[PDB]
Amino acid sequence: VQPLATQCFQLSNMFNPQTEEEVGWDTEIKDDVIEECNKHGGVIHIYVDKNSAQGNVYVKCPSIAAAIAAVNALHGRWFAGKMITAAYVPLPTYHNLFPDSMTATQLLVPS
Amino acid sequence: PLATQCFQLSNMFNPQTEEEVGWDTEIKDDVIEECNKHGGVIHIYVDKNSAQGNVYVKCPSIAAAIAAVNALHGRWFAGKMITAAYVPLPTYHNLFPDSMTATQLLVPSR
């Protein structure tokens, strides 16, 4: 029984720190995910965990509908033979990991 | 953020998990098994008195701890997302003085 959608999710397999070779790769991912979210329901917080062996990117969207749209756009792509996968994170768990994300309510839309 | 030999896992269990016999041995063995796919583990303390599900770990080098932390942080365990935070070496040695002289790599219970 799959977990219900929340405003918050974790993408996996977005990179592999052992093999990433391009300078600035993790910021490129952050900006590219923001850009993709902005073709859907936007995004209010994002963190690329550059040390994560499983390639985790954390995202908070302004509504559950927005998160579903972002998750459905990003998951299902293939990187180095692995599928980008998304898992919803309960709000209290996400806020504990990222305390600044709790009071963020304005969309990251580059000027 | 300061990498060390020591870390704290959180959200690994809750008080209801404690209602089954041997629950903490299952958790210790699962942590050991994962550490032994990386750099091993020489001390582990499952904090039965934490509502937050805390497990304390010391590895034989900073490299071993980093390999474990980067594999475990953000991982799902028993239906919950786990977080890992480094513990300064003197902090861990003050909290768990018996970990100072532990040097044998741990293996899962029989």
Partner: peptide, 8 residues
């Protein structure tokens, strides 16, 4: 059979 990667 560990509980790592066990989804809720």
């Amino acid at each position: 059979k560990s509980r790592w990667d066990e989804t809720p």
